Amino acid sequence: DLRTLGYSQQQQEKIKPKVRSTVAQHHEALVGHGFTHAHIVALSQHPAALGTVAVKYQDMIAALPEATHEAIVGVGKQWSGACALEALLTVAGELRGPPLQLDTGQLLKIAKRGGVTAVEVHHTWRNALTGAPLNLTPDQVVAIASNIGGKQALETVQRLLPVLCQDHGLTPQQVVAIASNGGGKQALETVQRLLPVLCQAHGLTPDQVVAIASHDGGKQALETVQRLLPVLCQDHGLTPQQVVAIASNIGGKQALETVQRLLPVLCQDHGLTPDQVVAIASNDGGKQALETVQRLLPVLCQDHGLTPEQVVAIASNGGGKQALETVQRLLPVLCQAHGLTPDQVVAIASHDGGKQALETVQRLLPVLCQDHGLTPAQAVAIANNNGGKQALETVQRLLPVLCQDHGLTPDQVVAIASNGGGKQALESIVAQ
């Protein structure tokens, strides 16, 4: 069927039998508008968008002059396609004027992320959202807009903004931050509900409540802080502020729950302290980091003679799980092939971007040594910093220019690179 119109079998299988005739109906017009077969497959995910784009494409370009084909597909593909593109046709001109002065990128972020409901709601509440007592900026409106629940979130901000600012000391920007993720309405209601609870009963500051709530899944994070804080504090040493640190990342809920689940075995069977457990749990991926520590701690200590302190240090940055697994992978490799010591592997891996710095060291070391005199120790010294991946990467790139055009020796390049008081300094040198 659709293959006779130039679609591959894969493209066709992707479409969905009951939509294929609709595709076939509008195919000619769509490709005539410049859409590829790929565009049309994706578009078909929302059948009605096939026809509205087939017709009206020209009106869309008139309403949205910078709009690319894929941008149109990205909007039209979604749950409200579709009448979101129709809503844009009708309201775009006004939204472009006062009070919001929206641009087409913004107009495209709302309809795509927040659907028809978001589009028509901005228009409708155009003036209220920007006037007293709210006085939101266009940017803030767009950020609340552009989400599932975007419309509900805008309606709730209108209602709760003044109550939160006037009864709880929140700033308008704090309210916006809370409202600017998925389920903004629930997040706002939960903050209204739990803020006095957490401040009065557990000694959280309002800033702490805001920080927990202003991430994806913030509502659920707040609710699990409310439930688990008393238990964590009574059962273990955990302080309100430790709990807040765990909860204030994406995945905060699961991170708190996993501390709850794993802290006892991690402390009793692996000899860690609650402070160490907290440290591991207080970054994005805390849940996996904790689970990975439970899993790999003994293997890392028994196979590579790492200490628990070292294992904790590796796991106590964003993506601890990946960091730990990477040490497990590359520690023997770098020690056997590239000279490095296990303490040196640990040191490189124990920074914000440790996992990537390890892989960069593995990748670039053989090259830095062949082309320039670089020793494994010099490579370590570079990688052993907050940056590191970038530091090593820029050394490899800038080295030839540094040595030929700026007179540096490779050992001089290393010296400057291996600090933090460097790297930017290498770049600065070459910008002259």
Side-chain angles (χ1 to χ4, degrees), residues 313-351 353-363:
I314 297 169
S316 293
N317 300 114
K321 166 192 167 80
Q322 330 295 349
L324 287 170
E325 293 175 340
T326 296
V327 164
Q328 183 182 35
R329 282 204 298 287
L330 294 182
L331 175 39
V333 174
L334 296 170
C335 289
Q336 295 183 55
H338 296 108
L340 276 83
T341 84
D343 278 347
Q344 283 177 323
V345 168
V346 169
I348 294 171
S350 297
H351 299 271
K355 118 105 173 186
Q356 307 256 305
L358 278 184
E359 297 184 316
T360 300
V361 160
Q362 174 200 205
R363 175 171 72 90

mmCIF file of all heavy atoms in Angstrom, residues 313-363, unseen atoms left out:
data_model
loop_
_atom_site.group_PDB
_atom_site.id
_atom_site.type_symbol
_atom_site.label_atom_id
_atom_site.label_comp_id
_atom_site.label_asym_id
_atom_site.label_seq_id
_atom_site.Cartn_x
_atom_site.Cartn_y
_atom_site.Cartn_z
ATOM 1 N N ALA A 313 33.460 8.074 48.085
ATOM 2 C CA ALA A 313 33.901 9.268 47.368
ATOM 3 C C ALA A 313 33.524 9.215 45.880
ATOM 4 O O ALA A 313 33.141 10.223 45.274
ATOM 5 C CB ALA A 313 35.396 9.455 47.523
ATOM 6 N N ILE A 314 33.641 8.039 45.284
ATOM 7 C CA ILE A 314 33.319 7.883 43.871
ATOM 8 C C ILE A 314 31.808 8.029 43.643
ATOM 9 O O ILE A 314 31.362 8.634 42.658
ATOM 10 C CB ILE A 314 33.806 6.520 43.357
ATOM 11 C CG1 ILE A 314 35.331 6.434 43.458
ATOM 12 C CG2 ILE A 314 33.347 6.282 41.900
ATOM 13 C CD1 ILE A 314 35.868 5.051 43.233
ATOM 14 N N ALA A 315 31.031 7.500 44.588
ATOM 15 C CA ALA A 315 29.584 7.439 44.462
ATOM 16 C C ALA A 315 28.895 8.747 44.857
ATOM 17 O O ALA A 315 27.689 8.904 44.657
ATOM 18 C CB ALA A 315 29.038 6.293 45.297
ATOM 19 N N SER A 316 29.658 9.677 45.423
ATOM 20 C CA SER A 316 29.098 10.911 45.978
ATOM 21 C C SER A 316 29.107 12.087 45.004
ATOM 22 O O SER A 316 29.279 13.228 45.417
ATOM 23 C CB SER A 316 29.837 11.302 47.265
ATOM 24 O OG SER A 316 29.593 10.363 48.290
ATOM 25 N N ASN A 317 28.918 11.803 43.717
ATOM 26 C CA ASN A 317 28.721 12.847 42.709
ATOM 27 C C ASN A 317 27.559 12.447 41.824
ATOM 28 O O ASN A 317 27.080 11.315 41.902
ATOM 29 C CB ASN A 317 29.987 13.069 41.872
ATOM 30 C CG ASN A 317 31.179 13.489 42.720
ATOM 31 O OD1 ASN A 317 32.161 12.754 42.839
ATOM 32 N ND2 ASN A 317 31.087 14.663 43.331
ATOM 33 N N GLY A 318 27.085 13.369 41.000
ATOM 34 C CA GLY A 318 26.023 13.039 40.062
ATOM 35 C C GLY A 318 26.347 11.746 39.323
ATOM 36 O O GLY A 318 27.498 11.521 38.946
ATOM 37 N N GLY A 319 25.340 10.894 39.133
ATOM 38 C CA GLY A 319 25.523 9.615 38.463
ATOM 39 C C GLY A 319 26.553 8.698 39.110
ATOM 40 O O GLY A 319 27.428 8.146 38.439
ATOM 41 N N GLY A 320 26.446 8.528 40.421
ATOM 42 C CA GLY A 320 27.348 7.658 41.149
ATOM 43 C C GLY A 320 27.377 6.246 40.597
ATOM 44 O O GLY A 320 28.435 5.623 40.548
ATOM 45 N N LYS A 321 26.214 5.737 40.199
ATOM 46 C CA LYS A 321 26.120 4.390 39.654
ATOM 47 C C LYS A 321 27.061 4.213 38.460
ATOM 48 O O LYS A 321 27.802 3.235 38.383
ATOM 49 C CB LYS A 321 24.693 4.080 39.214
ATOM 50 C CG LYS A 321 24.583 2.839 38.338
ATOM 51 C CD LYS A 321 23.198 2.744 37.697
ATOM 52 C CE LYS A 321 23.150 1.716 36.577
ATOM 53 N NZ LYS A 321 23.010 0.331 37.084
ATOM 54 N N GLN A 322 27.013 5.161 37.532
ATOM 55 C CA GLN A 322 27.819 5.087 36.326
ATOM 56 C C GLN A 322 29.289 5.231 36.688
ATOM 57 O O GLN A 322 30.134 4.513 36.161
ATOM 58 C CB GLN A 322 27.409 6.181 35.331
ATOM 59 C CG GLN A 322 25.933 6.587 35.412
ATOM 60 C CD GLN A 322 24.987 5.467 35.019
ATOM 61 O OE1 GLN A 322 25.411 4.438 34.493
ATOM 62 N NE2 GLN A 322 23.698 5.664 35.268
ATOM 63 N N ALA A 323 29.582 6.161 37.594
ATOM 64 C CA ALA A 323 30.937 6.376 38.074
ATOM 65 C C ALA A 323 31.526 5.094 38.673
ATOM 66 O O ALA A 323 32.653 4.704 38.368
ATOM 67 C CB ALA A 323 30.949 7.505 39.111
ATOM 68 N N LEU A 324 30.755 4.446 39.534
ATOM 69 C CA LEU A 324 31.214 3.226 40.170
ATOM 70 C C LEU A 324 31.466 2.140 39.131
ATOM 71 O O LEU A 324 32.486 1.457 39.179
ATOM 72 C CB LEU A 324 30.206 2.737 41.214
ATOM 73 C CG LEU A 324 30.114 3.519 42.521
ATOM 74 C CD1 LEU A 324 28.899 3.047 43.335
ATOM 75 C CD2 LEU A 324 31.406 3.398 43.334
ATOM 76 N N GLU A 325 30.533 1.968 38.200
ATOM 77 C CA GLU A 325 30.678 0.926 37.186
ATOM 78 C C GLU A 325 31.886 1.192 36.292
ATOM 79 O O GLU A 325 32.542 0.267 35.808
ATOM 80 C CB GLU A 325 29.410 0.820 36.337
ATOM 81 C CG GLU A 325 28.206 0.304 37.116
ATOM 82 C CD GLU A 325 26.930 0.316 36.293
ATOM 83 O OE1 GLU A 325 26.876 1.052 35.282
ATOM 84 O OE2 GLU A 325 25.984 -0.411 36.664
ATOM 85 N N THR A 326 32.175 2.466 36.086
ATOM 86 C CA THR A 326 33.252 2.857 35.198
ATOM 87 C C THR A 326 34.593 2.592 35.875
ATOM 88 O O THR A 326 35.549 2.130 35.232
ATOM 89 C CB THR A 326 33.107 4.333 34.750
ATOM 90 O OG1 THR A 326 31.907 4.475 33.978
ATOM 91 C CG2 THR A 326 34.310 4.777 33.928
ATOM 92 N N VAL A 327 34.663 2.878 37.172
ATOM 93 C CA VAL A 327 35.848 2.522 37.946
ATOM 94 C C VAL A 327 36.038 1.007 37.866
ATOM 95 O O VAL A 327 37.132 0.521 37.593
ATOM 96 C CB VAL A 327 35.746 3.004 39.417
ATOM 97 C CG1 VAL A 327 36.782 2.291 40.292
ATOM 98 C CG2 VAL A 327 35.893 4.529 39.497
ATOM 99 N N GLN A 328 34.963 0.257 38.069
ATOM 100 C CA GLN A 328 35.056 -1.195 37.956
ATOM 101 C C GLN A 328 35.609 -1.620 36.588
ATOM 102 O O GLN A 328 36.408 -2.551 36.510
ATOM 103 C CB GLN A 328 33.712 -1.883 38.226
ATOM 104 C CG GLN A 328 33.832 -3.408 38.168
ATOM 105 C CD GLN A 328 32.516 -4.121 38.373
ATOM 106 O OE1 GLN A 328 31.468 -3.636 37.953
ATOM 107 N NE2 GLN A 328 32.562 -5.285 39.025
ATOM 108 N N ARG A 329 35.196 -0.926 35.527
ATOM 109 C CA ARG A 329 35.667 -1.224 34.162
ATOM 110 C C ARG A 329 37.105 -0.816 33.906
ATOM 111 O O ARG A 329 37.889 -1.587 33.368
ATOM 112 C CB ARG A 329 34.843 -0.470 33.109
ATOM 113 C CG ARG A 329 33.515 -1.048 32.798
ATOM 114 C CD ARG A 329 33.070 -0.613 31.414
ATOM 115 N NE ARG A 329 32.907 0.833 31.292
ATOM 116 C CZ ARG A 329 31.909 1.527 31.834
ATOM 117 N NH1 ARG A 329 30.978 0.917 32.574
ATOM 118 N NH2 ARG A 329 31.844 2.837 31.634
ATOM 119 N N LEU A 330 37.429 0.425 34.252
ATOM 120 C CA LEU A 330 38.646 1.041 33.747
ATOM 121 C C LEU A 330 39.803 1.043 34.741
ATOM 122 O O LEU A 330 40.933 1.328 34.359
ATOM 123 C CB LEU A 330 38.360 2.455 33.222
ATOM 124 C CG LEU A 330 37.459 2.529 31.967
ATOM 125 C CD1 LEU A 330 37.274 3.970 31.497
ATOM 126 C CD2 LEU A 330 37.998 1.662 30.832
ATOM 127 N N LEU A 331 39.531 0.720 36.005
ATOM 128 C CA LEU A 331 40.600 0.678 37.016
ATOM 129 C C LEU A 331 41.681 -0.345 36.647
ATOM 130 O O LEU A 331 42.863 -0.017 36.618
ATOM 131 C CB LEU A 331 40.035 0.423 38.423
ATOM 132 C CG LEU A 331 40.971 0.223 39.631
ATOM 133 C CD1 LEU A 331 42.174 1.120 39.595
ATOM 134 C CD2 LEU A 331 40.208 0.501 40.900
ATOM 135 N N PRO A 332 41.276 -1.585 36.359
ATOM 136 C CA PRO A 332 42.281 -2.566 35.941
ATOM 137 C C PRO A 332 42.937 -2.176 34.616
ATOM 138 O O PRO A 332 44.152 -2.313 34.476
ATOM 139 C CB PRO A 332 41.475 -3.866 35.783
ATOM 140 C CG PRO A 332 40.040 -3.442 35.686
ATOM 141 C CD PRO A 332 39.924 -2.169 36.464
ATOM 142 N N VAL A 333 42.151 -1.677 33.667
ATOM 143 C CA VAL A 333 42.696 -1.290 32.366
ATOM 144 C C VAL A 333 43.788 -0.223 32.476
ATOM 145 O O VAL A 333 44.886 -0.385 31.938
ATOM 146 C CB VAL A 333 41.588 -0.789 31.404
ATOM 147 C CG1 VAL A 333 42.207 -0.254 30.133
ATOM 148 C CG2 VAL A 333 40.596 -1.902 31.099
ATOM 149 N N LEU A 334 43.471 0.872 33.163
ATOM 150 C CA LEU A 334 44.391 2.000 33.308
ATOM 151 C C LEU A 334 45.614 1.625 34.158
ATOM 152 O O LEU A 334 46.721 2.115 33.925
ATOM 153 C CB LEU A 334 43.665 3.198 33.938
ATOM 154 C CG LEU A 334 42.499 3.862 33.189
ATOM 155 C CD1 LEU A 334 41.756 4.858 34.095
ATOM 156 C CD2 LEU A 334 42.963 4.551 31.892
ATOM 157 N N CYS A 335 45.414 0.765 35.156
ATOM 158 C CA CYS A 335 46.536 0.317 35.993
ATOM 159 C C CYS A 335 47.471 -0.618 35.224
ATOM 160 O O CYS A 335 48.688 -0.530 35.351
ATOM 161 C CB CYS A 335 46.036 -0.344 37.276
ATOM 162 S SG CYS A 335 45.311 0.840 38.456
ATOM 163 N N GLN A 336 46.900 -1.498 34.408
ATOM 164 C CA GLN A 336 47.696 -2.450 33.630
ATOM 165 C C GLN A 336 48.315 -1.881 32.356
ATOM 166 O O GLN A 336 49.424 -2.244 31.989
ATOM 167 C CB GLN A 336 46.861 -3.678 33.266
ATOM 168 C CG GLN A 336 46.435 -4.509 34.458
ATOM 169 C CD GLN A 336 45.685 -5.744 34.024
ATOM 170 O OE1 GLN A 336 46.180 -6.533 33.220
ATOM 171 N NE2 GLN A 336 44.481 -5.915 34.545
ATOM 172 N N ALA A 337 47.586 -1.005 31.676
ATOM 173 C CA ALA A 337 48.001 -0.547 30.368
ATOM 174 C C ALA A 337 48.696 0.794 30.426
ATOM 175 O O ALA A 337 49.611 1.065 29.647
ATOM 176 C CB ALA A 337 46.799 -0.457 29.452
ATOM 177 N N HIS A 338 48.254 1.645 31.342
ATOM 178 C CA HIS A 338 48.610 3.048 31.258
ATOM 179 C C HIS A 338 49.411 3.507 32.452
ATOM 180 O O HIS A 338 49.595 4.707 32.641
ATOM 181 C CB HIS A 338 47.359 3.917 31.062
ATOM 182 C CG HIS A 338 46.637 3.659 29.774
ATOM 183 N ND1 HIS A 338 45.419 3.014 29.716
ATOM 184 C CD2 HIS A 338 46.969 3.947 28.491
ATOM 185 C CE1 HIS A 338 45.027 2.922 28.455
ATOM 186 N NE2 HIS A 338 45.948 3.482 27.694
ATOM 187 N N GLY A 339 49.881 2.550 33.251
ATOM 188 C CA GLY A 339 50.756 2.832 34.373
ATOM 189 C C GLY A 339 50.031 3.150 35.672
ATOM 190 O O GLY A 339 50.450 2.703 36.754
ATOM 191 N N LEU A 340 48.939 3.910 35.555
ATOM 192 C CA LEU A 340 48.190 4.417 36.705
ATOM 193 C C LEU A 340 48.094 3.503 37.929
ATOM 194 O O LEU A 340 48.084 2.277 37.814
ATOM 195 C CB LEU A 340 46.782 4.833 36.286
ATOM 196 C CG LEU A 340 46.640 6.231 35.699
ATOM 197 C CD1 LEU A 340 46.999 6.232 34.224
ATOM 198 C CD2 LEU A 340 45.218 6.726 35.906
ATOM 199 N N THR A 341 48.016 4.131 39.102
ATOM 200 C CA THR A 341 47.745 3.442 40.360
ATOM 201 C C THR A 341 46.251 3.515 40.672
ATOM 202 O O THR A 341 45.559 4.436 40.225
ATOM 203 C CB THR A 341 48.491 4.115 41.539
ATOM 204 O OG1 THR A 341 47.718 5.221 42.025
ATOM 205 C CG2 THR A 341 49.856 4.632 41.089
ATOM 206 N N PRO A 342 45.748 2.549 41.455
ATOM 207 C CA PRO A 342 44.361 2.512 41.931
ATOM 208 C C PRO A 342 43.966 3.781 42.686
ATOM 209 O O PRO A 342 42.830 4.234 42.521
ATOM 210 C CB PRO A 342 44.350 1.322 42.881
ATOM 211 C CG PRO A 342 45.428 0.438 42.377
ATOM 212 C CD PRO A 342 46.496 1.347 41.843
ATOM 213 N N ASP A 343 44.872 4.346 43.491
ATOM 214 C CA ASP A 343 44.586 5.605 44.171
ATOM 215 C C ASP A 343 44.390 6.720 43.153
ATOM 216 O O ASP A 343 43.584 7.633 43.357
ATOM 217 C CB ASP A 343 45.720 5.996 45.132
ATOM 218 C CG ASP A 343 45.637 5.282 46.474
ATOM 219 O OD1 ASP A 343 44.588 4.669 46.789
ATOM 220 O OD2 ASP A 343 46.632 5.356 47.226
ATOM 221 N N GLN A 344 45.156 6.662 42.070
ATOM 222 C CA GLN A 344 45.050 7.660 41.012
ATOM 223 C C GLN A 344 43.729 7.554 40.250
ATOM 224 O O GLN A 344 43.150 8.565 39.837
ATOM 225 C CB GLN A 344 46.216 7.523 40.028
ATOM 226 C CG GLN A 344 47.533 8.089 40.532
ATOM 227 C CD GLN A 344 48.659 7.864 39.544
ATOM 228 O OE1 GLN A 344 48.718 6.822 38.885
ATOM 229 N NE2 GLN A 344 49.555 8.841 39.429
ATOM 230 N N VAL A 345 43.265 6.329 40.048
ATOM 231 C CA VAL A 345 41.990 6.118 39.370
ATOM 232 C C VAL A 345 40.883 6.696 40.229
ATOM 233 O O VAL A 345 39.997 7.400 39.736
ATOM 234 C CB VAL A 345 41.731 4.628 39.099
ATOM 235 C CG1 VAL A 345 40.286 4.393 38.664
ATOM 236 C CG2 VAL A 345 42.697 4.118 38.034
ATOM 237 N N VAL A 346 40.963 6.413 41.527
ATOM 238 C CA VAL A 346 39.980 6.893 42.492
ATOM 239 C C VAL A 346 39.936 8.417 42.497
ATOM 240 O O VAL A 346 38.857 9.014 42.541
ATOM 241 C CB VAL A 346 40.316 6.386 43.907
ATOM 242 C CG1 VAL A 346 39.453 7.093 44.982
ATOM 243 C CG2 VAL A 346 40.149 4.877 43.964
ATOM 244 N N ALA A 347 41.110 9.046 42.440
ATOM 245 C CA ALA A 347 41.170 10.501 42.515
ATOM 246 C C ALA A 347 40.501 11.152 41.297
ATOM 247 O O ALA A 347 39.717 12.094 41.432
ATOM 248 C CB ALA A 347 42.604 10.973 42.671
ATOM 249 N N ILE A 348 40.805 10.649 40.107
ATOM 250 C CA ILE A 348 40.172 11.155 38.895
ATOM 251 C C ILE A 348 38.660 10.942 38.931
ATOM 252 O O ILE A 348 37.887 11.842 38.591
ATOM 253 C CB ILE A 348 40.738 10.472 37.637
ATOM 254 C CG1 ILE A 348 42.213 10.839 37.438
ATOM 255 C CG2 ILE A 348 39.933 10.865 36.400
ATOM 256 C CD1 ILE A 348 42.905 10.027 36.324
ATOM 257 N N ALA A 349 38.243 9.751 39.354
ATOM 258 C CA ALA A 349 36.829 9.379 39.348
ATOM 259 C C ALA A 349 36.001 10.133 40.397
ATOM 260 O O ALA A 349 34.781 10.239 40.262
ATOM 261 C CB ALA A 349 36.685 7.883 39.536
ATOM 262 N N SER A 350 36.670 10.665 41.422
ATOM 263 C CA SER A 350 35.989 11.348 42.514
ATOM 264 C C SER A 350 35.674 12.829 42.281
ATOM 265 O O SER A 350 35.606 13.602 43.226
ATOM 266 C CB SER A 350 36.779 11.174 43.819
ATOM 267 O OG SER A 350 36.834 9.800 44.165
ATOM 268 N N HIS A 351 35.448 13.222 41.035
ATOM 269 C CA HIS A 351 34.979 14.576 40.759
ATOM 270 C C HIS A 351 33.611 14.558 40.100
ATOM 271 O O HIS A 351 33.189 13.527 39.563
ATOM 272 C CB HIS A 351 35.962 15.328 39.866
ATOM 273 C CG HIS A 351 37.320 15.485 40.467
ATOM 274 N ND1 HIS A 351 37.660 16.558 41.260
ATOM 275 C CD2 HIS A 351 38.424 14.704 40.392
ATOM 276 C CE1 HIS A 351 38.918 16.434 41.651
ATOM 277 N NE2 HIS A 351 39.404 15.317 41.139
ATOM 278 N N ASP A 352 32.934 15.708 40.140
ATOM 279 C CA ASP A 352 31.647 15.886 39.487
ATOM 280 C C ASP A 352 31.500 15.055 38.226
ATOM 281 O O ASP A 352 30.533 14.295 38.084
ATOM 282 N N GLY A 353 32.465 15.184 37.317
ATOM 283 C CA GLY A 353 32.411 14.467 36.051
ATOM 284 C C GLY A 353 33.448 13.363 35.936
ATOM 285 O O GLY A 353 34.121 13.228 34.911
ATOM 286 N N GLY A 354 33.557 12.562 36.993
ATOM 287 C CA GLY A 354 34.565 11.520 37.096
ATOM 288 C C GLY A 354 34.507 10.447 36.031
ATOM 289 O O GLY A 354 35.517 10.161 35.382
ATOM 290 N N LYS A 355 33.331 9.853 35.841
ATOM 291 C CA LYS A 355 33.172 8.787 34.854
ATOM 292 C C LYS A 355 33.667 9.197 33.470
ATOM 293 O O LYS A 355 34.292 8.402 32.769
ATOM 294 C CB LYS A 355 31.710 8.332 34.778
ATOM 295 C CG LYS A 355 31.048 8.537 33.410
ATOM 296 C CD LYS A 355 30.905 7.229 32.649
ATOM 297 C CE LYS A 355 30.085 7.412 31.378
ATOM 298 N NZ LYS A 355 29.805 6.117 30.687
ATOM 299 N N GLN A 356 33.385 10.433 33.071
ATOM 300 C CA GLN A 356 33.755 10.873 31.728
ATOM 301 C C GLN A 356 35.243 11.204 31.680
ATOM 302 O O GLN A 356 35.899 11.011 30.666
ATOM 303 C CB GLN A 356 32.909 12.070 31.289
ATOM 304 C CG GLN A 356 31.401 11.839 31.415
ATOM 305 C CD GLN A 356 30.720 11.584 30.077
ATOM 306 O OE1 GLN A 356 30.840 12.384 29.146
ATOM 307 N NE2 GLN A 356 29.997 10.467 29.978
ATOM 308 N N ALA A 357 35.776 11.691 32.792
ATOM 309 C CA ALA A 357 37.202 11.969 32.876
ATOM 310 C C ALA A 357 38.030 10.677 32.800
ATOM 311 O O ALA A 357 39.113 10.668 32.231
ATOM 312 C CB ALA A 357 37.528 12.747 34.145
ATOM 313 N N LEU A 358 37.519 9.589 33.367
ATOM 314 C CA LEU A 358 38.214 8.309 33.296
ATOM 315 C C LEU A 358 38.299 7.814 31.865
ATOM 316 O O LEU A 358 39.354 7.376 31.403
ATOM 317 C CB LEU A 358 37.502 7.256 34.146
ATOM 318 C CG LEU A 358 37.823 7.293 35.635
ATOM 319 C CD1 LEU A 358 37.137 6.128 36.348
ATOM 320 C CD2 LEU A 358 39.335 7.261 35.858
ATOM 321 N N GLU A 359 37.168 7.884 31.174
ATOM 322 C CA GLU A 359 37.071 7.429 29.800
ATOM 323 C C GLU A 359 37.899 8.313 28.880
ATOM 324 O O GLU A 359 38.526 7.837 27.932
ATOM 325 C CB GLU A 359 35.605 7.411 29.373
ATOM 326 C CG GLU A 359 34.768 6.442 30.179
ATOM 327 C CD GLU A 359 33.337 6.357 29.693
ATOM 328 O OE1 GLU A 359 32.736 7.414 29.409
ATOM 329 O OE2 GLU A 359 32.822 5.228 29.586
ATOM 330 N N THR A 360 37.925 9.603 29.184
ATOM 331 C CA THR A 360 38.746 10.530 28.423
ATOM 332 C C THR A 360 40.222 10.214 28.625
ATOM 333 O O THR A 360 40.997 10.244 27.672
ATOM 334 C CB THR A 360 38.459 11.997 28.815
ATOM 335 O OG1 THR A 360 37.079 12.293 28.555
ATOM 336 C CG2 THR A 360 39.341 12.963 28.029
ATOM 337 N N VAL A 361 40.612 9.911 29.864
ATOM 338 C CA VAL A 361 41.996 9.532 30.140
ATOM 339 C C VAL A 361 42.388 8.273 29.367
ATOM 340 O O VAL A 361 43.406 8.247 28.687
ATOM 341 C CB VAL A 361 42.255 9.299 31.639
ATOM 342 C CG1 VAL A 361 43.501 8.450 31.828
ATOM 343 C CG2 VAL A 361 42.404 10.625 32.363
ATOM 344 N N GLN A 362 41.571 7.235 29.474
ATOM 345 C CA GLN A 362 41.797 6.023 28.713
ATOM 346 C C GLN A 362 41.938 6.334 27.224
ATOM 347 O O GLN A 362 42.831 5.818 26.548
ATOM 348 C CB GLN A 362 40.638 5.045 28.895
ATOM 349 C CG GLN A 362 40.799 3.833 28.001
ATOM 350 C CD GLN A 362 39.519 3.070 27.768
ATOM 351 O OE1 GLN A 362 39.558 1.883 27.470
ATOM 352 N NE2 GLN A 362 38.384 3.740 27.886
ATOM 353 N N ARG A 363 41.049 7.181 26.715
ATOM 354 C CA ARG A 363 40.991 7.455 25.282
ATOM 355 C C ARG A 363 42.189 8.260 24.788
ATOM 356 O O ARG A 363 42.748 7.981 23.721
ATOM 357 C CB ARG A 363 39.689 8.192 24.924
ATOM 358 C CG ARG A 363 39.600 8.626 23.449
ATOM 359 C CD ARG A 363 38.203 9.166 23.065
ATOM 360 N NE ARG A 363 37.894 10.488 23.624
ATOM 361 C CZ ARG A 363 38.168 11.647 23.028
ATOM 362 N NH1 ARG A 363 38.770 11.666 21.845
ATOM 363 N NH2 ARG A 363 37.844 12.791 23.614
#
